[PDB]
């Protein structure tokens, strides 16, 4: 009795219990170093981060495991996940996306009345290093949720959490949070179109200062976030 | 215009790391070992040419025999000219044997306007091997204020330990698809160091110290999924990066 | 019109400070309190009597058990009460907003508070100010309270002053005994000067 | 440059700053009186509450102001809002939905780059007692968002907040929260179908014990919630 | 089968509230005033019939003249039988004049299996009027364990003060569309009181106290948007609810 | 295997209690600590030394500045550390989980904690236990600490015992001085009996 139109809202719900709010993915470093001090610099950070780390690692990896799941190719899915783990150097950024992946799967599995199907269950048994984005990709294909739609909700949900981190920690007025989310709608559509275009040769395309700030996050004198 | 460099080393009859076999064609100029420390051999790599042009390709092959402790320092700058409708390429395969240590980096890259450059680096190690490897990329000719005018740059690294992948890097830089000056990529800096330490006798806190002592460097170190170290750093010039790299190399070769 | 938030751990003297502040200042100033630190109906009352304020000048606002969110990322109901307090008092010059008790990571949304006072006390530890949360570093004024408990708990006030000055830079902090009105004049002076 | 596909996710985001988390709409009373002690009784509460207070007051009122907004009938919209105010007896429940309505409008208006159109702006100027559901209805019609879709997102969002209240306050394991949200999908669809069927004669259909528990919430000895 | 009750009151020549005009047809039986307090008159309403059947309809009209302080107590139970393909109805229009007080409730409703009942109550007040109005609804014949077997019940209230609406109630009970036993509706109780106090000399805390003293009542009081009081209560029998209502009526009529 | 959460305001003695508890009990019991009360790297250290525990037996988990959410509605990272602690210690019989400091509304998700100990102290007020939050009423054991400060702050311990017994019913509470190991044996006795 499962309705995909509701299920997609449920797994992308900000309160869906994977613990996203404990992670800044390096943003906390940019803040303590006074590179994100206000609405305009926050929007700059977000555009740059989404166009680099998020597009080539998170979004593209989701598309890849979706497509492989459709052909029930478990081997290619685990290969994508190995690439991501061996390519993501900053430890707190690597561990963040892995822990979120663990939580995502454990939560789906905790719901006994949701039948994910033989392939997803097989995936869930074998996966060594799932991330939130790869496991979500397999989830959406398994349930016949349309790729473009799956991407749209996932992108919005992850971005909202980054914007809220900015609101909490800069801090910014909660209204600025909403202006930023509105400004990002053209970029969101460009990102989705780009994701559909990109082949797997672009997977895990390197960022530079983003990685460095994610590593510097380990040594902060005082901090609130796990990454 | 296919340039080659092939190098094979072994512990010599005198107990020292020596060249067992080599070969090269221009631009490459290979020099003979010298011995700063007891077990430590150093071999300089130089380049005699004005740069790479459309169609140019390099092939490098390194084989570091068992028990060799070797430092290969590349003393030139690799300049990529306008390649028009073509491209220049650099392929490197590196093999490090049992209980061997290799310290290596290729020439820093300086892409000119409309340069198109591709490179691929594969490195095979044994569980007892030790490795220090790095790459530097610069924005353009900063002297003439040419920043990110190249066509496209794509370089890749794969490091295997007993046939099992332990590290990857995929670097794609295309000024047409993004502003490489943004705060997530080059962030106003012109020079980028990426460096890996595999199975070296050094603690993360030690590496973190060298980075802090380095002036004019925005940089950092962290532990990889395979339990090795990765360092990334940005600078306004090659010297602060090259110097930082020297200090790190020193910390591992005194142990 | 000028909003000043007061946060700090449970039992640190946030309420005592606000009561002693309005006792002195309400004479010369048009002012009111919004407070998130309430459980029982008999809480909001006790604050009115101790502060010598009419009940219409104090509004309690529940947090749903989320005292951090209530002053920070979704301040909605607190902001609703602010707009309410402006409806009741058109000439209002000063509004004190008390949190529901929190930790060193507590901050106010800029939409809610124009300035922030963080309140810790000596018996929590002398190593508290070097832990360095946003409550220690970001707040416009820090208040270290219950200094009279110092010799009984073994709290070194040179240590606390040293570490505080280090963390806040030139951002002012004030040592305090609220029961004895000690330092209370300093705090009052700060509000008049800084927030005006 | 506004994309309605994103905007609808944005205004229904759990972190969209209207203050829903501070309100239990009477649930806190049910909990302290030991009527909701676990997953099974929580699901009972939710089914009963959604089929009564939420269906006939919240959802139906949203459909009504949507339809009136399409014809630009401002008078009928303000009439629906007057009926709700005069019909909702428990004070904390009445004030909760009103405050949430204020916050919802103030937040949309704070975003200066969103053009709501002449009619919504006229609405926002005249409205005396908007609630979250009525103002949302006018919002969706003004932007050409399809009714059925508007209802789906609104229903999910408001329900997730009730389930989280259960998780926090009972308490329940966060997994139980998710099983509940999954169990509610058939009822969600029934509710939407019902909302489309119902005419305005059903508006503010009385509940009984729900109202009484909402009133009893005023006198609780110790409490965490505003309603 | 159209039943009527019409009643008009005035301050009489002796200074007491008196019936100025009346009329009724069965089932209604109206009795003559008695005087518990000085200003307080009480008039009993009774019913002589075995209930309402298909097609039955009642029309009630109350007019309470200026300065009248009146208590109308309905001493019977209204039973709705199986109405088949038809329904039974109750319409009431109530008018309260300046400085007048009215205490009134219709007979408690006991719907039998397949009973279909509709009712509409409109009340007009003047700014100086005072009102205590209530309605009780039962689940069925609890004696024989008939709970929620009726077809459908729909009752409505509108209260206007100087032509301006200050209160509405819309009660729709249909056991086919919902389980009326659920914890948001009847919650295991069989009897429901809904009560309104408009412009009465009583504080919310005073009403709250009466409710607390009442045994076997789960009930509460709250302030309406128009600044009046509303009381709702559930019970396992009519007596606890009727008693509670007496206590509240007493609190207002001693002031 | 048996998880026991410890919450309470900042400065109330949560850490002191956990350190003094492991000092005594770790001898006869296989046990570990997860803690949300950390800011600086030098925090997690100081707990290892004072508690006489190896570093692998204490895991710090950051809350993102949301210490209530971290033990309650989304406990995800704490739950992740629990499963980690079970990977390190297959024979583990007791796991102490310390919150990031909080108020009287603090509760643990049942998935996270099997039992809960709430810690307040005398200097916060003697009217604290009658405020009646879920920390006072719901917790399996309440600890009233720093009783030695009582005469100096004017705290009436008959009042505190009266009000506590009223609020908790038959749910046990224990008066305590942790510095003096006073009542510490009672707490230890409770854990052995109740949580086993
Ligand atoms: N010894 C001492 N006690 C104080 C001082 N200031 C406040 N207190 C007491 O500390 C306790 C907690 O104060 P309270 O206002 O309730 O703290 P809050 O929880 O932040 O509002 C109360 O019993 C106060 O009387 C002080 O300077 N010295
Ligand atoms: N007088 C007194 N002080 C105590 C007692 N227990 C702890 N303290 C002190 O109060 C402070 C409590 O610190 P801590 O246990 O870290 O509080 P936490 O924030 O709940 O973890 C420390 O400085 C202790 O020295 C006690 O029983 N009596």
Numbering used by the authors:
A (entry chain C), D (entry chain A): 28 to 254
B (entry chain D), E (entry chain B): 6 to 260
C (entry chain E), F (entry chain F): 1 to 196
Give sentences from the paper:
Urease is a nickel containing metalloenzyme that hydrolyses urea into ammonia. UreG is a SIMIBI (after signal recognition particle, MinD, and BioD) class GTPase involved in the regulation of nickel delivery. The interactions between urease and its accessory proteins were further supported by yeast-two-hybrid and tandem affinity purification. It was hypothesized that the UreG/UreF/UreH complex is responsible for delivery of nickel ions into the urease active site and the formation of the preactivation complex is a critical step involved in urease maturation.
To gain insight into the urease maturation process, we determined the structure of the UreG/UreF/UreH complex in its GDP-bound state to 2.35 Å resolution using X-ray crystallography. The asymmetric unit contains two copies of each of UreF, UreH, and UreG, related by 2-fold symmetry, forming a dimer of heterotrimers. The UreG/UreF/UreH complex structure represents the first known structure of UreG. The topology of UreG is characteristic of SIMIBI class GTPases containing the canonical G1 to G5 motif for guanine nucleotide recognition. Two GDP ligands are sandwiched between two UreG protomers. UreG contains an invariant Cys66-Pro67-His68 metal binding motif, substitution of which abolishes the metal binding properties of UreG. This metal binding motif is found at the dimer interface between two UreG protomers. Cys66 and His68 from each protomer are arranged in a symmetric formation that could potentially bind a metal ion at the interface. The crystal structure also showed that UreG interacts strictly with UreF only, leading to an overall structure resembling that of an inverted-T shape. Each UreG protomer makes extensive contacts with both protomers of UreF.
